[PDB]
Structure 1
Amino acid sequence: LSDEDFKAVFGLTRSAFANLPLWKQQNLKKEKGLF
């Protein structure tokens, strides 16, 4: 996943998402369907 594609999936860029707490990251990707 590129930054823009990732941003399309999560609504956040990789750095912005990685800026989040890991539990929320795992939660978000879970909800997105990215295990």
Structure 2
Amino acid sequence: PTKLETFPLDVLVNTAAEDLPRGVDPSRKENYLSDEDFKAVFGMTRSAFANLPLWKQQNLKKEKGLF
């Protein structure tokens, strides 16, 4: 698919789901973080995160306000 746009961490954490930017899926907020923000928040590669069990992906996001 088309490369996703990048959005600041605070926009993703503070904006209600229905108020988010066009193209932004609130169930996949981590995919819109810049590489710098993703690395800082999750401390692992995107592929590594995507390969984790769903419960773990969700739990890590919950502790960061990204779920």
**Whole-angstrom distance in 2 between the partners of 1:24 and 1:13:** 15
**SS at 1:32's partner residue?**
coil
Higher relative contact order (CA closer than 8 Å, sequence separation 6+)? 2
Residues 4, 13 of structure 1: 8 Å contact kept: no
Specify every segment of 5 or more residues in structure 2 that has no aligned partner in the other structure, as ranges. Answer: 1-32
Q: CA deviation at 1:18?
A: 0.7
Specify every segment of 5 or more residues in structure 1 that has no aligned partner in the other structure, as ranges. Answer: none
**Whole-angstrom distance in 1 between the partners of 2:47 and 2:38:** 10
Identity, in percent, stands at 97
TM-score (norm 1): 0.73
Cα RMSD over matched residues? 1.2
TM-score (norm 2): 0.45
Structure with the higher fraction of residues in helix conformation: 1
Provide, for residues 1-35 of structure 1, a one-character-per-residue CA deviation record: whole Å limited to 9, x for no partner.
13332111111121111111011000000011112
Which aligned runs of 4 or more in structure 1 are off by greater than 4 angstroms?
none
**Whole-angstrom distance in 2 between the partners of 1:5 and 1:25:** 16
